[PDB]
Amino acid sequence: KVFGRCELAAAMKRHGLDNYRGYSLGNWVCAAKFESNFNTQATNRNTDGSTDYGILQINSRWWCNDGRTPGSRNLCNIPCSALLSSDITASVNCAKKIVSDGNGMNAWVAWRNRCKGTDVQAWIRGCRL
Ligand code: NA
Numbered sequence: 001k002v003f004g005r006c007e008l009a010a011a012m013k014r015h016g017l018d019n020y021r022g023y024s025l026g027n028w029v030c031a032a033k034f035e036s037n038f039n040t041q042a043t044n045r046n047t048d049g050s051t052d053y054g055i056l057q058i059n060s061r062w063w064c065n066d067g068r069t070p071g072s073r074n075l076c077n078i079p080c081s082a083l084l085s086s087d088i089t090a091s092v093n094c095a096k097k098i099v100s101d102g103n104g105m106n107a108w109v110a111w112r113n114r115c116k117g118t119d120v121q122a123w124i125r126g127c128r129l
Contacts, residue, residue: 001086003038006127008055008088009102013129015092019101020101026120027094031111032056033123040091041084054083054091056085056108063094 003011009029012117018025035057036042044052050061050069060069064080064113076094083091105111 001033001040003040003055004025004129005033005123008032008038009124009127009129011088012092015089017092017095019107019129020096021104023099024107024120026123027065027105027111027115030115030118030120031105031108032116036112040088043084051080053080054085055088055093056091058083058091058098059065063098063121078126099103 012028013025017028031047032055036055038055040055042054042057044057046052046059049062050059050072051066053057053064058064058076060066060080061072062076063074063076064083065074068079070124075095076090078090078094083094099105101107105116
């Protein structure tokens with residue numbers, strides 16, 4: 001599924017992402033914009049052979065099982081495919097564990113490089129939330 005901006009903002013809020021670990025909804029929407037362009041089916045193969053899955057491009061090295069990332073963990077206790085669902089529940093639950101890991105949203109390199117320190121509230125501007 002390709003979400004609308006305000007549509008994704010609403011889904012993330014509904015699943016308690018807004019101000020989760022102190023990160024406003026605009027941070028989450030910005031990260032999703034640059035990770036996936038709001039496409040739940042987005043995948044990206046990394047050089048290390050791990051893969052990134054879904055609206056927030058969660059990686060198989062730590063967070064999900066894809067059966068093809070040697071020596072990897074599955075800390076969200078999910079098949080990586082669950083992260084490609086039109087239903088963002090698995091992505092949001094897993095993102096809550098990731099953003100709790102110690103480095104906050106710096107875990108998403110694209111959030112650090114493209115969202116961090118920017119006017120992120122622009123990403124929920126005009127949305128009925
Ligand atoms: Na894994």
